[PDB]
Structures are given as C-alpha cells and as structure tokens.
Coordinates of C-alpha atoms in Angstrom, one line a residue:
Chain A
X1 CA 90.5 74.3 123.4
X2 CA 88.4 73.8 120.5
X3 CA 86.3 71.3 122.4
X4 CA 85.4 74.0 124.9
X5 CA 84.2 76.4 122.0
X6 CA 82.3 73.9 120.5
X7 CA 80.5 72.9 123.5
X8 CA 79.8 76.6 124.4
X9 CA 78.7 77.1 120.9
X10 CA 76.2 74.3 121.1
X11 CA 75.0 75.5 124.6
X12 CA 73.6 78.9 123.4
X13 CA 69.8 78.4 123.3
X14 CA 67.9 77.9 120.0
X15 CA 65.8 81.0 120.6
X16 CA 63.1 81.9 117.9
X17 CA 64.0 82.7 114.0
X18 CA 64.6 86.8 114.7
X19 CA 67.3 86.3 117.3
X20 CA 69.8 84.7 114.8
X21 CA 69.1 87.4 112.2
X22 CA 69.5 89.9 114.7
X23 CA 73.0 88.4 115.8
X24 CA 74.0 88.1 112.1
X25 CA 73.2 92.1 111.9
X26 CA 75.1 92.8 114.5
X27 CA 78.2 91.0 113.7
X28 CA 77.9 92.7 110.4
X29 CA 77.5 96.0 112.0
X30 CA 80.7 95.2 114.1
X31 CA 82.7 94.5 111.1
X32 CA 81.7 97.6 109.4
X33 CA 82.3 99.7 112.5
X34 CA 85.9 98.6 112.5
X35 CA 86.3 99.0 108.8
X36 CA 85.2 102.7 109.2
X37 CA 87.1 103.0 112.3
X38 CA 90.5 102.4 110.7
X39 CA 89.7 104.7 107.5
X40 CA 90.8 108.1 108.7
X41 CA 94.4 108.8 110.1
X42 CA 94.2 110.7 113.4
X43 CA 97.7 112.3 112.5
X44 CA 98.3 114.1 115.9
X45 CA 98.1 118.1 116.1
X46 CA 100.4 119.9 113.6
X47 CA 101.1 116.7 111.8
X48 CA 100.2 115.1 108.5
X49 CA 99.9 111.9 106.5
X50 CA 99.9 111.5 102.9
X51 CA 98.8 108.1 101.7
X52 CA 100.9 105.1 102.5
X53 CA 100.6 102.2 100.0
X54 CA 101.7 99.7 97.3
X55 CA 99.4 100.2 94.5
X56 CA 100.9 99.1 91.2
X57 CA 102.2 102.9 90.6
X58 CA 101.4 105.5 93.1
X59 CA 99.3 108.5 93.0
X60 CA 100.7 111.7 94.5
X61 CA 97.2 113.7 94.4
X62 CA 95.5 112.8 97.5
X63 CA 97.7 114.6 100.1
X64 CA 96.3 115.2 103.3
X65 CA 96.0 118.4 105.5
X66 CA 95.8 117.7 109.4
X67 CA 94.3 115.1 111.2
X68 CA 91.0 114.3 109.6
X69 CA 92.1 112.6 106.3
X70 CA 90.9 109.7 104.6
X71 CA 92.5 106.3 105.0
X72 CA 91.7 102.8 104.5
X73 CA 93.5 99.1 105.7
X74 CA 96.2 98.2 103.5
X75 CA 94.8 100.8 101.1
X76 CA 96.0 103.8 103.1
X77 CA 98.6 102.7 105.2
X78 CA 99.3 105.9 107.4
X79 CA 102.1 106.7 109.5
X80 CA 101.7 109.8 111.5
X81 CA 104.1 112.1 109.7
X82 CA 105.2 115.4 111.9
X83 CA 105.1 118.3 109.6
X84 CA 105.9 119.8 113.0
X85 CA 109.6 120.8 113.0
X86 CA 112.2 118.4 114.1
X87 CA 115.9 119.9 114.3
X88 CA 119.4 118.6 113.9
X89 CA 123.1 119.5 114.6
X90 CA 126.2 118.2 112.8
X91 CA 130.0 119.2 112.9
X92 CA 132.9 118.8 110.9
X93 CA 136.6 118.5 111.3
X94 CA 138.4 120.7 108.4
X95 CA 141.9 121.2 107.1
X96 CA 141.5 124.9 107.0
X97 CA 143.4 127.2 104.8
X98 CA 146.3 127.1 107.3
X99 CA 145.5 123.5 107.6
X100 CA 144.6 124.1 111.2
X101 CA 142.2 121.4 112.3
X102 CA 139.0 123.3 112.5
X103 CA 136.2 121.8 114.4
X104 CA 133.0 123.6 113.5
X105 CA 129.5 122.8 114.8
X106 CA 126.2 123.6 112.7
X107 CA 122.7 123.4 114.0
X108 CA 120.5 122.6 111.1
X109 CA 116.8 123.3 111.3
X110 CA 115.2 120.7 108.6
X111 CA 111.5 120.4 108.5
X112 CA 108.8 118.1 106.7
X113 CA 106.5 119.1 104.2
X114 CA 102.6 118.7 103.8
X115 CA 101.5 118.4 100.2
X116 CA 104.6 117.3 99.1
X117 CA 104.9 114.4 102.0
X118 CA 106.0 111.7 99.4
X119 CA 109.6 111.9 98.8
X120 CA 110.1 112.0 102.4
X121 CA 107.8 109.2 103.9
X122 CA 108.8 106.1 102.0
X123 CA 112.3 106.0 100.1
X124 CA 113.8 108.9 102.3
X125 CA 111.9 106.7 105.0
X126 CA 110.3 107.8 108.1
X127 CA 114.0 108.6 109.0
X128 CA 114.4 111.2 106.1
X129 CA 116.3 113.9 107.9
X130 CA 118.8 111.4 109.6
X131 CA 119.4 110.1 105.9
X132 CA 119.7 113.5 104.7
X133 CA 121.6 116.0 106.9
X134 CA 125.0 114.3 108.2
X135 CA 127.5 114.5 105.3
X136 CA 126.0 117.3 103.5
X137 CA 126.9 119.4 106.6
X138 CA 130.4 117.7 106.4
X139 CA 131.0 118.8 102.9
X140 CA 129.8 122.3 103.8
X141 CA 131.8 122.6 106.5
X142 CA 135.1 121.2 104.9
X143 CA 134.5 122.8 101.9
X144 CA 134.0 126.3 103.4
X145 CA 136.7 126.1 106.3
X146 CA 139.3 124.9 104.0
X147 CA 138.1 128.1 102.4
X148 CA 138.3 130.1 106.0
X149 CA 141.4 130.5 108.3
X150 CA 141.2 130.2 111.7
Chain B
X1 CA 58.1 81.9 104.2
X2 CA 59.9 84.0 106.9
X3 CA 62.6 81.2 107.3
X4 CA 63.1 81.3 103.6
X5 CA 63.6 85.0 103.6
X6 CA 66.0 84.8 106.6
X7 CA 68.0 82.2 104.9
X8 CA 68.1 84.0 101.5
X9 CA 69.4 87.1 103.4
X10 CA 72.0 85.3 105.3
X11 CA 73.5 83.8 101.7
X12 CA 73.2 87.1 100.4
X13 CA 75.4 88.6 103.3
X14 CA 77.7 86.0 103.0
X15 CA 78.3 86.3 99.4
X16 CA 78.8 90.3 99.9
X17 CA 81.2 89.8 102.4
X18 CA 83.1 87.3 100.5
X19 CA 83.2 89.8 97.6
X20 CA 84.3 92.6 99.6
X21 CA 87.2 90.4 101.0
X22 CA 88.3 89.5 97.5
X23 CA 88.1 93.0 96.2
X24 CA 90.1 94.6 99.2
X25 CA 92.7 92.0 99.0
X26 CA 93.4 93.2 95.4
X27 CA 93.0 96.7 96.0
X28 CA 95.3 99.2 97.9
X29 CA 95.3 103.1 97.5
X30 CA 97.1 106.0 96.2
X31 CA 100.3 107.0 98.3
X32 CA 102.6 109.1 96.5
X33 CA 105.9 107.6 95.3
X34 CA 105.8 104.0 94.9
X35 CA 104.9 102.2 91.6
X36 CA 104.6 98.3 92.3
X37 CA 104.3 96.1 89.4
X38 CA 102.5 93.0 88.4
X39 CA 104.6 90.0 89.4
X40 CA 104.0 87.5 87.1
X41 CA 105.6 84.0 86.0
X42 CA 104.5 83.6 82.6
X43 CA 106.1 86.9 81.2
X44 CA 108.2 87.8 84.4
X45 CA 107.0 90.7 86.2
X46 CA 104.8 92.1 83.6
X47 CA 106.9 94.5 81.3
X48 CA 104.2 97.2 81.9
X49 CA 104.7 99.6 84.8
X50 CA 101.3 99.6 86.7
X51 CA 100.4 103.3 86.6
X52 CA 100.4 105.7 89.4
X53 CA 96.6 105.9 89.8
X54 CA 95.2 103.4 92.3
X55 CA 96.1 100.6 89.8
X56 CA 95.5 97.3 91.2
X57 CA 97.1 93.9 91.4
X58 CA 95.0 90.7 90.1
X59 CA 95.4 88.2 93.1
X60 CA 98.6 86.5 94.0
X61 CA 100.5 87.7 91.0
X62 CA 101.6 90.8 92.1
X63 CA 102.8 90.3 95.5
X64 CA 103.1 94.0 96.1
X65 CA 106.4 95.0 94.8
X66 CA 106.9 98.2 97.0
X67 CA 108.9 99.9 94.4
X68 CA 109.5 102.8 96.6
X69 CA 109.9 105.2 93.7
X70 CA 110.8 108.1 95.7
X71 CA 114.2 109.4 96.5
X72 CA 117.0 108.2 99.1
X73 CA 120.6 109.2 99.9
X74 CA 123.1 106.6 100.2
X75 CA 126.8 107.5 101.6
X76 CA 129.6 105.6 100.3
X77 CA 133.0 106.0 101.9
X78 CA 136.2 105.3 100.1
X79 CA 139.6 105.1 101.4
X80 CA 141.3 106.3 98.2
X81 CA 145.0 106.4 97.6
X82 CA 145.9 110.1 96.3
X83 CA 148.6 110.8 93.5
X84 CA 151.1 111.2 96.4
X85 CA 149.5 107.8 97.8
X86 CA 148.2 109.3 100.9
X87 CA 145.0 107.3 102.3
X88 CA 142.5 109.9 101.9
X89 CA 139.0 109.1 103.4
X90 CA 136.3 110.5 101.3
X91 CA 132.4 109.8 102.0
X92 CA 130.2 110.7 98.9
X93 CA 126.5 111.1 99.2
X94 CA 124.6 109.7 96.2
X95 CA 121.1 110.9 96.1
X96 CA 119.1 108.2 94.0
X97 CA 115.7 106.8 92.9
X98 CA 114.5 104.0 90.7
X99 CA 112.9 104.5 87.2
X100 CA 109.0 104.1 87.3
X101 CA 108.7 102.3 83.8
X102 CA 111.1 99.5 84.2
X103 CA 110.3 98.4 87.6
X104 CA 108.9 95.4 86.3
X105 CA 112.3 94.2 84.7
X106 CA 114.1 95.8 87.9
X107 CA 112.4 92.9 89.9
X108 CA 112.7 90.0 87.5
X109 CA 116.5 90.7 87.5
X110 CA 117.2 92.1 90.9
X111 CA 113.9 92.2 92.8
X112 CA 112.4 94.8 95.6
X113 CA 115.9 95.6 96.9
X114 CA 117.2 97.2 93.8
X115 CA 119.3 99.9 95.0
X116 CA 121.8 98.3 97.4
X117 CA 123.3 96.1 94.6
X118 CA 124.4 99.1 92.6
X119 CA 125.6 102.0 94.5
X120 CA 128.5 100.7 96.5
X121 CA 130.0 99.3 93.5
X122 CA 129.9 102.2 91.2
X123 CA 130.7 104.6 93.8
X124 CA 133.7 102.9 95.2
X125 CA 135.1 102.3 91.7
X126 CA 134.6 105.9 90.7
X127 CA 135.8 107.6 93.7
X128 CA 138.9 105.6 93.3
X129 CA 139.0 106.4 89.5
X130 CA 138.9 110.3 90.5
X131 CA 140.9 110.6 93.8
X132 CA 143.6 108.1 92.1
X133 CA 144.2 110.8 89.3
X134 CA 144.0 113.5 92.3
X135 CA 146.7 114.1 95.2
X136 CA 145.9 114.5 99.0
Chain C
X1 CA 102.4 46.2 114.5
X2 CA 101.2 44.1 111.1
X3 CA 98.7 42.3 113.1
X4 CA 97.1 45.7 114.3
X5 CA 97.1 46.7 110.5
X6 CA 95.3 43.3 109.8
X7 CA 92.8 43.4 112.4
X8 CA 91.8 46.9 111.3
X9 CA 91.4 45.9 107.7
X10 CA 89.3 43.2 108.5
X11 CA 87.2 45.2 111.0
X12 CA 86.2 47.2 108.0
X13 CA 82.6 46.6 107.1
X14 CA 81.7 44.4 104.2
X15 CA 79.2 46.6 102.6
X16 CA 77.5 46.4 99.2
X17 CA 79.4 46.0 96.1
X18 CA 79.7 49.7 95.2
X19 CA 81.6 51.0 97.8
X20 CA 84.5 48.8 97.0
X21 CA 84.8 50.0 93.3
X22 CA 84.2 53.8 94.9
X23 CA 87.2 53.2 97.2
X24 CA 89.3 51.9 94.3
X25 CA 88.4 55.0 92.3
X26 CA 89.3 57.0 95.1
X27 CA 92.8 55.5 95.6
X28 CA 93.5 55.7 91.9
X29 CA 92.6 59.5 91.8
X30 CA 94.8 60.1 94.9
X31 CA 97.6 58.3 93.2
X32 CA 97.2 60.4 90.1
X33 CA 97.2 63.5 92.0
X34 CA 100.5 62.6 93.7
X35 CA 102.1 61.6 90.3
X36 CA 101.1 65.1 89.0
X37 CA 102.2 66.9 92.1
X38 CA 105.8 65.7 91.9
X39 CA 105.7 66.5 88.3
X40 CA 105.5 70.4 88.1
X41 CA 108.7 71.9 90.0
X42 CA 107.9 75.4 91.8
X43 CA 111.5 76.5 90.7
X44 CA 111.4 79.7 92.9
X45 CA 110.6 83.1 91.9
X46 CA 113.2 84.2 89.1
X47 CA 114.9 80.8 88.9
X48 CA 114.9 78.2 86.2
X49 CA 115.4 74.6 85.4
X50 CA 116.6 72.3 82.7
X51 CA 115.3 69.0 82.5
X52 CA 117.6 67.1 85.2
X53 CA 117.4 64.0 83.0
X54 CA 117.7 60.2 84.0
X55 CA 116.9 59.1 80.2
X56 CA 118.0 60.1 76.7
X57 CA 120.9 61.7 78.0
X58 CA 119.9 65.0 79.3
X59 CA 118.1 66.5 76.4
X60 CA 119.9 70.0 76.4
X61 CA 116.8 71.7 74.6
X62 CA 113.8 71.5 77.0
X63 CA 114.8 74.3 79.0
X64 CA 112.3 75.8 81.6
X65 CA 111.3 79.5 82.0
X66 CA 110.7 80.3 85.5
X67 CA 108.1 78.9 87.5
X68 CA 105.6 77.4 85.5
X69 CA 107.5 74.4 83.9
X70 CA 107.2 70.5 84.4
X71 CA 109.5 67.8 86.0
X72 CA 109.2 64.2 85.3
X73 CA 109.4 62.3 88.6
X74 CA 112.7 60.4 89.0
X75 CA 113.6 61.3 85.6
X76 CA 113.5 65.1 86.5
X77 CA 114.7 66.7 89.8
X78 CA 115.0 70.3 88.7
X79 CA 116.9 71.3 91.8
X80 CA 116.3 75.0 91.9
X81 CA 118.7 76.5 89.6
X82 CA 118.7 80.3 90.7
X83 CA 119.3 82.1 87.1
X84 CA 118.7 85.3 89.2
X85 CA 122.0 87.2 90.3
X86 CA 124.3 85.9 93.2
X87 CA 127.3 88.5 93.6
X88 CA 130.9 87.7 94.3
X89 CA 134.0 89.5 95.5
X90 CA 137.6 88.1 94.9
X91 CA 140.8 89.7 95.9
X92 CA 144.6 89.5 95.0
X93 CA 147.9 90.4 96.5
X94 CA 150.2 91.2 93.5
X95 CA 153.9 91.8 93.0
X96 CA 153.8 95.0 91.1
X97 CA 156.4 96.0 88.8
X98 CA 158.7 97.4 91.3
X99 CA 158.3 94.0 93.5
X100 CA 156.0 96.0 95.8
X101 CA 153.2 93.7 97.1
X102 CA 149.8 95.5 96.4
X103 CA 146.2 94.1 97.4
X104 CA 143.7 94.4 94.8
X105 CA 139.9 93.8 95.1
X106 CA 137.4 93.1 92.3
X107 CA 133.8 92.4 92.7
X108 CA 132.1 90.2 89.9
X109 CA 128.6 90.2 89.0
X110 CA 128.2 86.8 87.1
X111 CA 125.0 85.2 86.1
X112 CA 123.7 82.0 84.2
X113 CA 122.0 81.9 80.9
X114 CA 118.7 80.4 80.8
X115 CA 118.7 78.5 77.3
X116 CA 122.1 77.1 78.0
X117 CA 121.1 75.8 81.4
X118 CA 121.6 72.3 80.4
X119 CA 125.4 71.9 80.5
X120 CA 125.4 74.8 83.0
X121 CA 124.0 72.7 85.4
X122 CA 124.8 69.3 84.6
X123 CA 128.4 70.2 83.7
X124 CA 128.9 72.9 86.3
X125 CA 126.5 71.6 88.9
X126 CA 124.1 73.7 90.9
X127 CA 127.1 75.9 92.0
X128 CA 128.2 77.1 88.6
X129 CA 129.2 80.5 89.6
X130 CA 131.5 79.4 92.4
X131 CA 133.0 76.6 90.0
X132 CA 133.7 79.6 87.6
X133 CA 134.6 83.0 88.9
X134 CA 137.7 82.8 91.0
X135 CA 140.6 81.6 88.8
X136 CA 139.8 83.6 86.1
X137 CA 139.4 86.8 88.3
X138 CA 142.6 86.0 89.9
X139 CA 144.4 85.3 86.5
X140 CA 143.0 88.7 85.1
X141 CA 144.0 90.4 88.4
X142 CA 147.5 89.1 88.6
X143 CA 148.0 89.4 84.6
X144 CA 147.2 92.9 84.5
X145 CA 148.9 93.9 87.7
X146 CA 152.3 92.5 86.8
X147 CA 152.0 94.5 84.1
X148 CA 150.8 97.5 86.1
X149 CA 153.5 99.1 88.6
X150 CA 151.9 100.0 92.1

C-alpha cells in the first residue's frame, strides 16, 4: 500500500516554484479551517454546553448560552446538554399507617440548568437525572405513606 | 532569491505547526468542576491541586487525571438485621464528591477512581451499625 | 543456516580502514544502550521496588520510590511491587455463644510499606497481601464472635 502512495507522490509533476508554495498554503488553510470548525458547540435549539475539559483544575466561569458558544478540541470537549426539559416517573411500595401495602406512583419533572451546568454534566454524569431521582422518590413515598392511611 | 524565500517560509510554517501542536497537547480549557492534578513520579502527583483556571499540565507528567470534582449520588442497599432480627432491606442514597486540594494525594494512593473504593464499605458497615440498633 | 550467515559476512565489502572502527564503535554503543536499558525498572505508576538482589544478600536499605529508580541486570529483577492498594474480603461462619451458626463478612484494606519492602517482597514474596490477610482476619472474627452471641 505504501509503495502505491510513494509512486503516486513521485508521479506528481514537478511544476514551477510557485505551485509548491500554493499547495503548502492550501494545506495550512485546510488545517486552520478544521480547527476553527471544531471551535463552537452547535448545541441544538433550547440546549446548552458548559465547557467540558480536564484542566488541572476547572474554571466554572465560561458558561455558555444556547447554541453559539466557544469550544476547542480537547480544550472544550462539548456534549450537547439539553437544558430543555426531560421528565421522570418513579413508584413506591410503602408500609402505610394501616400497614397496607400502598403502591404510589409519582411523576417528577426535573430539568437541567444553563449557568450551573457543571454539577450536572460530569459527576452527576450525562445521566444526571437517572442518578438522582429514583430512591429519593422512594424515600419520599415510603415516609409519607407510612404516614398516610389507605 | 525566490527559492530561498520559499524555503524559509516553509521552514517557518513547519516550526509554527510543531509549536502549536505542542501547545495544544499541553492545553485544555475551563470546563466547570474537574480539578486534574500534575501526575509526577518524582514527588508522586504534585502535592498542589492545579487551580481551577485553565491551569495546565506539562507534557506527559499529568496524564489528565479527570478529578471530576462535581457531585454524584450513590445508592447502597443493606439487608440489615433489625432488633427483632427481621431482614430489612434499606437503600441509602449518599450524595458525595471529592476534595479539590488533595486530588494529588487521592491519585497517588487510590487513583482517578477514588469514589467507588469508599462509599460501599462505610455505608454498609454504618447502615448495619444503625439498623442493628433499630427494630423492623 | 550457518553457511548462509558466513556467506553474507564474507560478502560485506572490504572497505577502507575507518569503517571497521566505526562499526566496532557502533556495536559498543548499542551494547551499552541495552545494558543501560535493562537497568532502570519502570515499576509502574504508584508502584515500588526493593533491590531484588543477586549479591551481597539483598541489601534491605536501597529501596526505590515509584518509577524513577534503577535495577541492576541479573542482580535486580524488581518485579513490579504494587505498593498501591489491592482490597480484600474475607468471611467466616462462627458458632455464636448460643451455638447458632452465624455468617460474618469483613472487607480488609491492607497495604505494604515502601521502606520495609525488602523483606516484604523477599520474605512475603510478590503476593504479600494474600500471604497475610486471611488467617488473621479469621482468627479475629472467630475469637471475637465466639465471644459475641448472635
């Protein structure tokens, strides 16, 4: 495979001095274009992306309104955080006051923040709501239904 | 004269590209809520937490230790024997997070995955301590 | 096979006097490089090494911080001694005071010391922790639980 590439490279005509410099400039322009391309998270309508990074520390200042906001590769990892709502529902079998097994459902509408995207995105994970809601709902229902009769 | 100028331009462009590559490899922005730390052998991960600004790494020492210093909830179930000795299943949610400053030490001893080594042990031993003293 | 090697060696051109000395110098440099190479253990991140020794006893003094420390070849195989933590778990069924069988678990977090690595590794081998934890854990559990009713 490498032999074919070498032969093709050699077969390129040895044009005047200007053509090589033009090719070098074109390659540089393409690289710069790719670098600039990555550099703004096109977070979908009604979404956000705080910066995602690793930076020997992490500064929670540059928090970033809809769409157009300023990333870089491995400097700003984005992930398109949906500040638009995402709902939830959780149930609970409680030993009620009469010790009757009370199965109560509970639809929790927890949404993600924009200028405090951090705690969400990384350590709560992209799956923040899943990590958060289930057993808090369970505690709620069991505590309050052990407090309430049928 | 033109050939020398073109050669110098190409050499300067190559040098600029190399310098930019090095700078980018050492650099990475301000997210919120990690605090990575210089991962150095001579001292062990540098005793200093590397600050929350866009605070860098020098090459190859700080394998980005993604000290995700934000908060995570962790659910530990315990099948605890009550006073009447009824096997009661109790699931405890512990919200938790690491400490900013001592992320260096945390990696020298444990590593990136500090959290999972701890929460289950304390939580199980302690829910047992508690609900053992308590009835069904 | 040897005949082919002899023919190849003979086929090498008999050039001027200088390239022979140059080849000798290159061979010596390569040998020195390999000798240096084997002599610095890359005892992995967070690990340690004593001088695993083949002379003068095993001097239990020249102990080696993580990473940047030096093995002698054929006098120093610093197999990678993991001073980092490797957890453990041990259980025990005990006859409680009422002669009732009771299962008791116990997860241990035991680590080795860096500046007493010499006998830790020599004496207690690579697998110190496995050679250590179980019997003490069981002795403790049984001695304390035979005392403790169920």
